[PDB]
């Protein structure tokens, strides 16, 4: 007991010493020689209306046109973002949904929430209506995030401090990821879908191997609950938004925090975070009803996306980087370009 | 106009979806949403019976459809999902009166702390609370031998069922920091009482009328 605690403390000290030794310079002191991105002015182009409750999640399709959103009114709406047409409206058995995922193939959609069940709906049914194809159960906490890897496997994070990679056809947890001491609030899948980062309420993010199934890395530095996480497009870094007013960029290979994006005028929490196509711009949704676009290399607040009357709950960027969708508690999705 | 036949039919489908969504929202707006809360075995199961994650109980009383959401067994950080219940019509908080002589930290003190946290959080500033002081039949027997001074040493009243119940109710109501803007509907229930649903109906009727006054710009 005491000996094991002392050994754990020694290992943590060794890890911190290695991190400090590898921290020869900082990204801020390196990116002083590059020009700033200037004032980013993303104007709103589409406003998606039809959700009648607070919108909690939203995921873009890989075609960068179809967009799924989940609202507390028990609705999962699939939008044609180009024409603002409602392609699909799925009634949910549980109206307390906090996450939704869109399959890369587009044939399936996912949702989940306080029911502790990840519901997967088939969009390409022969009967022509969207029917529930799977109900993955086994998590003992609320479903906070879910992300498809393919049409048969999905990684879902829960409030029971664990994540799970499932087999949709069998309905069983292929792999269980445990080690977070707090509720896992977000997930992000690497571009190769071989690793994924999960941030939890223990103010910690964990890099997990999907196939191997163990925690590859652990990242700390946030002072409160981590609510959002997103891989950098390169796949060697990821950004975390926390309940404090700080976003933090961590590098996988350096195993360290690179930069902190924060301002004294910002004091509210962070709900969503995402990168642009190049990763130069970091878009974060805040409780102050606004979104902030930061220069990911210089930590300068490049711009502000304002126009939501309530808390910005979900944020997403298209695979082609064409537009940014922001869903807020005011029951509207806004597309910015 | 500048739309193909398939585009026009897709727009028609979107309009039909909009109409269905409006109908569903109108139907759901007339439903009374209750959030069932408690410190544990405080009678929530009995209340649900007489009236793995979220549990939903649907029941129609006097032309009002009630959806009661029980969050027991979640066993996670409440602050991470309590904001989902911001718009509920009311919060039904169940407290076991006989728990004053039990401990987990005293059970009654834990119930009071949970009630304070639920009432005074940023998400339930104006939400009304129906306080169900359950197990009054067992509390009457317990108060005959077990004094209330075990839970509240400051209690100077006589060890009687009525006085002790009134003191407990006053102590629970004193946890409200926004008494002007929020009302607490304390009720006493023992077992299989048919008047509990009527009390809930009256409380939610008052809440609904107040909400209608607020929405119409009249309050």
């Amino acid at each position, epitope marked *: 007991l005491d000996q094991l605690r002392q050994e754990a403390e020694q290992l943590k000290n060794q890890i911190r010493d290695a991190r400090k030794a590898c921290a020869d310079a900082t990204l801020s002191q390196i990116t002083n020689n590059i020009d700033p991105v200037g004032r980013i002015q993303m104007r709103t182009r589409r406003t998606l209306r039809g959700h009648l409750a607070k919108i909690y999640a939203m995921h873009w399709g890989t075609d960068s046109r179809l967009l799924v959103s989940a609202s507390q009114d028990g609705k999962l709406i699939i939008w044609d973002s180009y024409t603002t047409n409602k*392609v699909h409206a799925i009634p949910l058995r549980s109206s307390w949904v906090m996450t939704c995922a869109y399959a890369p193939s587009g044939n399936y959609v996912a949702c989940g929430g306080l029911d502790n069940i990840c519901s997967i709906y088939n969009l390409k049914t022969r009967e022509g209506n969207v029917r529930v194809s799977r109900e993955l159960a086994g998590h003992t906490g609320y479903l906070s995030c879910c992300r498809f890897l393919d049409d048969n496997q999905i990684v879902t994070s829960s409030g029971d401090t664990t994540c799970a990679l499932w087999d949709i056809e069998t309905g069983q947890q292929t792999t269980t990821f445990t080690g977070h001491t707090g509720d896992v609030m977000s997930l992000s899948l690497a571009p190769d879908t071989r690793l994924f980062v999960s941030g939890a309420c223990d103010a910690s993010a964990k890099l997990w191997d999907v196939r191997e199934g163990m925690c590859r890395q652990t990242f700390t530095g946030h002072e409160s609950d981590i609510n959002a996480i997103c891989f950098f497009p390169n796949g060697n870094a990821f950004a975390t938004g926390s309940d404090d007013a700080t976003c933090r960029l961590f590098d996988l290979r350096a195993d360290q925090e690179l930069m902190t994006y924060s301002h004294d005028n910002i004091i509210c929490g962070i709900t969503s975070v995402s990168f642009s196509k190049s990763g130069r711009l970091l878009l974060a949704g805040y409780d102050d009803f606004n979104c902030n676009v930061w220069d990911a290399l210089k930590a300068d607040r490049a711009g502000v996306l304002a126009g939501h009357d309530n808390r910005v709950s979900c944020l997403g960027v298209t695979d082609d980087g064409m537009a940014v969708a922001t869903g807020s508690w005011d029951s509207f999705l806004k597309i910015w370009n | 106009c500048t739309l193909s036949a398939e585009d026009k039919a897709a727009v028609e489908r979107s309009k039909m979806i909009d109409r269905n969504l409006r109908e569903d929202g109108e139907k759901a707006a007339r439903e009374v949403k209750l959030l069932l809360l408690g410190a544990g075995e405080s009678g929530k199961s009995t209340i649900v019976k007489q009236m793995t994650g979220i549990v939903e109980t649907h029941f129609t009383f006097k032309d009002l459809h009630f959806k009661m959401f029980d969050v027991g067994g979640q066993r996670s950080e409440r602050k991470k999902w309590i904001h989902c219940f911001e718009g509920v019509t009311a919060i039904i908080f169940c407290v076991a009166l006989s728990d004053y002589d039990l401990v987990l930290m005293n059970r009654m003190h834990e119930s009071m702390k949970l009630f304070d946290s639920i009432c005074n959080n940023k998400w339930f500033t104006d939400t009304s609370i129906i306080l169900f002081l359950n197990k009054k039949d067992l509390f009457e027997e317990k108060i005959k031998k077990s004094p209330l001074t075990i839970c509240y040493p400051e209690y100077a009243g006589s060890n009687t069922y009525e006085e002790a119940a009134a003191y407990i109710q006053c102590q629970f109501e004193d946890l409200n920091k926004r008494k002007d803007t929020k009302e607490i509907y304390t009720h006493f229930t023992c077992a299989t009482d048919t008047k509990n649903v009527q009390f809930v109906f009256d409380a939610v009727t008052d809440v609904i009328i107040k909400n209608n006054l607020k929405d119409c710009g009249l309050f």
Partner: single-chain antibody
Amino acid sequence: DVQLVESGGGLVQPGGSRKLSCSASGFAFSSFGMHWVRQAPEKGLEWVAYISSGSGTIYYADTVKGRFTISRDDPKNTLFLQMTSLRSEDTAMYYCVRSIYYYGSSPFDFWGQGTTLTVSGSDIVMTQATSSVPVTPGESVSISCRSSKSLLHSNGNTYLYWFLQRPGQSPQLLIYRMSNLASGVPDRFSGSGSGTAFTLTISRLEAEDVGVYYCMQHLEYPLTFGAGTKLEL
């Protein structure tokens, strides 16, 4: 699974009225638009009428406008076509066609068996260069078609549909929007086009896809079909 059964055909004296019905099963009939399509005994397919989901929009061909009435009863999942003052030119096999419309959808994907009814100008015209093509299994066959107006729209969609009708069978959707392979269709069939001239290429052809190939336009609403390219041997 999906099933459309037609009824009400037979002998009708000229100037009479008949009520064709189409019972639907295996799919959410209320959420689909429904078409009535004619095929004369040897003159190929011809669009007749259409009713939208929820009966929002109702359309008829100029040949049957003012005489035919299309309707739908969603609770009983039935499609109705009342024909009054039937002429000698109305003798044909009638099909009820399921057709849904959203982004990425596959309309005209299911056709009913159809019933035979025997009676005692500015729209886009679709033409097919060849009427009968003698083919041998294992080869590649290219069926070509042309349109009076370019089927490419401002949204980038080219509304062309390739259907196959086998002998004794209802037409089956092969290609929708000139490039998309319909569900259940093998990768042998591929669609291509330049906006006004289109080709359908079949590789490693077998005896299972021998029939008449029809091209249909969906850009301008009055849906018109090609003459039909029959494959033999």
